[PDB]
Design a protein around this ligand. Structure first.
Ligand SMILES: *[C@@H]1O[C@H](CO)[C@@H](O[C@@H]2O[C@H](CO)[C@@H](O[C@@H]3O[C@H](CO)[C@@H](O)[C@H](O)[C@@H]3O)[C@H](O)[C@H]2NC(C)=O)[C@H](O)[C@H]1NC(C)=O
Ligand SMILES: *[C@@H]1O[C@H](CO)[C@@H](O)[C@H](O)[C@H]1NC(C)=O
Ligand SMILES: *[C@@H]1O[C@H](CO)[C@@H](O)[C@H](O)[C@H]1NC(C)=O
Ligand SMILES: *[C@@H]1O[C@H](CO)[C@@H](O)[C@H](O)[C@H]1NC(C)=O
Ligand SMILES: *[C@@H]1O[C@H](CO)[C@@H](O)[C@H](O)[C@H]1NC(C)=O
Ligand SMILES: *[C@@H]1O[C@H](CO)[C@@H](O)[C@H](O)[C@H]1NC(C)=O
Ligand SMILES: *[C@@H]1O[C@H](CO)[C@@H](O)[C@H](O)[C@H]1NC(C)=O
Lengths: 498, 269, 269
């Protein structure tokens, strides 16, 4: 190719700048970079950026334009940009440039108090700035070693501390941290002052409720968090974990009220006071709303005889469980065609099975034991309702078996439409089915590894090809026999156009 | 009138106490020991795992942890009070912080508390004790060294605290054998009695023969087969006194040598 | 004519090699990495236990040990060449000597050899590698870190040497599977073949999926139940590659942080 020439790029500076390879501008101004290019055929030009996907100044910024334009630039918009120019002939042309947005936030001034001869206060001054800031201390007059100044470790020049080793009376004055960025990009210095007095003291709080607070649903609970010390006057703030405070909870400021409290509102509510003096004070209360859910039973045939079925002359455990908030406070009652038990039939409250599960054993099973058993979980004198689980034992009760009906082992569907996977379980009682995926370890439409279902149906509203694969269905270990779960597989084809 | 006066000394120092008069105390103990200007007594000495509890107890937040800023402050106060050198205190503070920083789990405020406690413990108790033991044994004094890693926690001390300054006294005095006292109210356990018996056996054995192992054997007693070897500067063997006792070597050698060899060097001679 | 010329560079540096031209290499790698000015590739990196064998191999006496004076000399040469600072090299040399001195068994010339070797290894290989891994993971690059603690000793290397620079190459290339070669004459053992298979499995797994654990499982093979967790600056998990493999945390955290945080500070900013 005689005349065809490889691309050649050159970056030029424009828009607002300040003062070699780097383009420094003040935050809020406008960036204008132009990429002049040559070569034949005329190469195309795109400005792009290079930034770690998962941290700090990152944007996905691919513009097809010989001019890069960022109006009202920001901290994060900063970084390294490269102009790429190609035309097919030879190697693409690349030129790099570092845009260095500069700034100087308002400094923060905090102070801390502290043998037994001299009292010492530390005045810490912190500020975020680009470039690194310069600190100057003054007590009306500029201070030098004549007390000590320095930068501690675990600070990249953003912090300086003024140490007052001996706190003499003249030192009780207004200290002001004046931080400068060398006026580069014509950026003004900034100052913050603090009134150091012998009454200056960190915050302190008092809470109107105990460490841990138990409550019933619907109850209204109000918590007064009041200051008991602090100069300057600290600011009190409430917070919640996990998640935010509302709905149905309002902060007057100091006063925290929760109306018609729901069970999900349980958790930690922390009151914190701050005045930029010492460590902030924090009072913490753990609010527990009572609840009972998911009552479940288990049929456990003779384990030592290695049985999976009810057989006369064997041990038969009938367990019971419920999920509760004050888990330690639950109590179970076992009824049997009415409410009775010493000989032959015995109670056991805490075996290897899930936590706090009451389970009676029937030694030497007998036709006389064939009946309807009931377990009743309750809270000692709580307004909440009781929960129960019925479990009929009879000659009919039998461990389960699972299979795929007819020939729906492999079921094909077109993408987008709805899909319905099917397993059918047999036994008395029938436990729920737990669906999982086997070809890979991925989650599901519900977003978790497994889904519960009683009808043995797995419904897929918007079936995606990603779902195409193999699926496992198996019997639960609860609400039925506590036995090796029975398994069965089904294939799911998600057809899609070519 | 003299007692009620308020006389505050420099931090970590004393106002009224023993002085170098050139008679009772012929010279600086450091000089006398380095030059071996002392008779050869039989010596037994030791320190506790967490001597410096009170050093950090006052700077601990409501979460039982210490902030990075508080840590810096403590060291800063520490350097100024003990190392009042005008030129070079900066490099010192930074070096000290690095050594007593746990770079594995460096962000944990509670680990920060432990290492800070260790700094004060190492400087005020461990380093001087090792220096004494090293010089005594080197100059021919029969030496025995111990580290006390046990105590009885009262409801007045933090649950996270280890054996603190003075916590060995009750064991040495056999207080556990007569149960809790008005002065020592901790609910001593069977293990406390057992350990107390052991300490008293070792202490009185030393008094009887100059050997903690003679004449009374340690008679389940975990010290049955544990002979307390003499301390020497080369092997620096010491007895680890606890519920799992055994002889070890070079107690905190790394941190001890920092204070005894490197820091003095940074003084610029 | 150009190749045969004698051009000696500064010690521990190069004369002819990659340069910062502002185009191919936009800026100092240190600045680019600190400011996260790089794309997020999948990264795997590591170092060997005893990289710096040749660093001390030449100063070892007939007893396989290093004298205290030779140790001082090596450090002195080390400080001057890498840290050409006029004011303060004294405190630096002394601090470096202290950190790399084993105060438990401080008189052993052979232990002295090991720690000196570690100094060069830590500075030239471990510290830079950790810095790279820390920055890559911090900026979102999937990172995997390893430490190679195995090798096949030929009759040409000292019996006391650990895995040296380049010793992992034969395993990565599967040389043990085809037996000793003219280039790699070591009499590879069954364990060498097993480890070689493992390394190749991990390396190619990374290439296939970006995950050393997928898709080929480690199929007695001691890596059967050992999943290589991703590296992060907080936990800094890495794979210990040897005949007893397992995942650890914060590889040589203490010594690594010395070079990456404290020493730079001693520069006086
Ligand atoms: C109601 O409560 C029952 C507990 O009585 C819940 O059943 C439990 O479900 C979890 C996860 O679905 C099971 O965890 C399992 O742990 C084993 C550990 O060996 C593991 O191999 C399994 O893959 C699974 O992760 C747990 O075993 C199971 N407990 C029993 C007794 O079956 C049930 O999910 C709750 N349902 C609702 C709607 O609240
Ligand atoms: C390039 O961008 C500038 C402003 O960013 C615009 O004025 C111009 O029309 C654009 N031209 C092309 C060819 O993209
Ligand atoms: C503090 O200063 C005030 C002056 O406002 C003075 O009245 C007081 O005695 C001083 N001492 C204390 C402990 O407040
Ligand atoms: C809770 O407050 C509502 C109004 O805010 C009131 O009607 C209700 O009776 C209160 N209930 C309790 C249990 O305090
Ligand atoms: C409240 O404090 C607890 C510990 O006391 C802590 O686990 C929780 O994260 C805190 N919540 C908030 C919002 O600060
Ligand atoms: C607390 O604040 C709520 C609103 O936030 C208010 O309705 C209630 O009357 C207040 N009670 C007290 C005791 O402050
Ligand atoms: C079990 O027996 C009880 C006894 O009244 C009956 O009500 C129930 O329908 C039976 N079947 C069950 C619980 O599935």
């Amino acid at each position: 190719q005689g005349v065809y020439a490889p691309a050649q790029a050159q970056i030029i500076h424009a828009g607002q700048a300040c003062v070699e390879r780097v383009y420094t501008i003040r935050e809020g101004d406008t960036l204008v970079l132009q990429c002049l290019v040559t070569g034949h055929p005329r190469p195309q030009v795109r400005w792009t950026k290079t930034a770690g996907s998962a941290s700090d100044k990152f944007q996905e910024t691919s513009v097809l334009n010989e001019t890069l334009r960022i109006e009202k630039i920001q901290r994060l918009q900063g970084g390294r940009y490269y102009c790429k120019a190609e035309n097919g002939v030879g190697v693409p042309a690349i030129k790099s440039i570092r845009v260095d947005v500069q700034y100087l936030d308002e400094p923060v001034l905090t102070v801390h108090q502290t043998f037994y001869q001299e009292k010492t206060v530390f005045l810490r001054c912190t500020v975020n700035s680009n470039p690194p800031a310069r600190f100057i201390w003054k007590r009306g007059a500029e201070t030098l070693s004549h007390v000590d100044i320095y930068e501690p470790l675990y600070t990249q020049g953003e912090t300086k501390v003024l140490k007052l080793k001996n706190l003499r009376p003249q030192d009780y004055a207004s200290y002001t941290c004046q931080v400068s960025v060398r006026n580069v990009c014509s950026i003004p210095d900034k100052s913050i002052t603090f009134q150091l007095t012998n009454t200056t003291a960190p915050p302190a709080l008092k809470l109107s409720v105990n460490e841990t607070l138990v409550v019933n649903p619907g109850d209204n609970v109000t918590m007064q968090c009041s200051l008991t010390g602090g100069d300057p006057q600290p600011e009190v703030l409430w917070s919640h974990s996990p998640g935010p405070l509302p709905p149905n909870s309002l902060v007057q400021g100091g006063n925290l009220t929760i109306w018609r409290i729901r069970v999900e509102d349980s958790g930690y509510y922390n009151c914190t006071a701050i005045n930029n003096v010492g460590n902030p004070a924090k009072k913490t209360v753990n609010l527990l709303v009572r609840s009972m859910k998911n009552a479940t039973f288990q049929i456990t045939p003779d384990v030592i005889k290695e049985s999976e079925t009810i057989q006369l002359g064997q041990d038969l455990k009938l367990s019971c469980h419920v999920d509760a908030v004050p888990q330690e406070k639950v109590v179970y009652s076992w009824y049997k065609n009415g409410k009775p038990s010493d000989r032959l039939l015995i109670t056991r409250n805490d075996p290897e099975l899930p936590p706090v599960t009451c389970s009676l054993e029937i030694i030497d099973l007998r036709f006389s034991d064939y009946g309807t058993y009931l377990c009743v979980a309750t809270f000692q004198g709580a307004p909440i309702p009781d929960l129960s689980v019925e479990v009929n034992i009879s000659s009919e009760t039998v461990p389960p078996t699972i299979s795929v009906p007819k020939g729906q082992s492999t079921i094909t569907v077109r993408e987008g439409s709805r899909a319905e996977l099917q397993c059918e379980v047999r036994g008395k009682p029938k436990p729920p089915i737990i669906w999982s995926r086997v070809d890979k370890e991925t989650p599901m439409p519900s977003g978790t590894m497994t889904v519960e279902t009683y009808d043995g149906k797995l419904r897929l509203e918007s079936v995606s090809r990603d779902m195409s694969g193999t699926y496992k269905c198996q019997t639960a270990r609860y609400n039925g026999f506590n036995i090796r779960p029975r398994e069965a597989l089904v294939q799911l084809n998600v057809q899609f156009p070519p | 009138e003299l007692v009620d006066q308020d006389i505050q000394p420099a931090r970590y120092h004393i106002a009224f106490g023993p002085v170098i008069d050139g008679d009772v105390i012929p010279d600086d103990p450091q000089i006398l020991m380095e030059q071996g200007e002392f008779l050869n007594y039989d010596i037994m000495l030791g320190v506790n795992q967490g001597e410096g509890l009170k050093f950090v107890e006052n700077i601990v937040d409501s979460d039982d942890g210490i902030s990075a800023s508080d840590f810096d402050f403590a060291v800063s106060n520490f350097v100024d009070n003990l190392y009042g050198y005008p030129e070079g205190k900066d490099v010192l503070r930074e070096t000290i912080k690095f050594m007593y920083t746990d770079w594995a789990d460096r962000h944990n405020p509670e680990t920060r508390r432990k290492t800070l406690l260790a700094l004060f413990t190492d400087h005020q108790w461990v380093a001087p004790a090792v220096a004494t033991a090293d010089l005594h044994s080197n100059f021919g004094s029969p030496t025995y060294f111990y580290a006390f890693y046990h105590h009885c926690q009262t409801d007045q001390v933090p649950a996270w605290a280890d054996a603190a300054h003075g916590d060995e006294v009750p064991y040495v005095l056999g207080i556990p054998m007569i149960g809790p006292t008005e002065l020592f109210p901790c609910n001593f356990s069977k293990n406390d009695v057992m350990l107390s018996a052991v300490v008293m056996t070792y202490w009185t054995n030393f008094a009887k023969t100059g050997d903690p192992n003679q004449p009374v054997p340690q008679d389940p007693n975990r010290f049955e087969e544990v002979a307390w070897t003499r301390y020497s500067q080369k092997d620096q063997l010491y007895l680890h006194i606890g519920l799992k006792p055994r002889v070890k070597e070079h107690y905190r050698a790394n941190k001890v040598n920092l204070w005894l060899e490197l820091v003095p060097h940074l003084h610029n001679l």
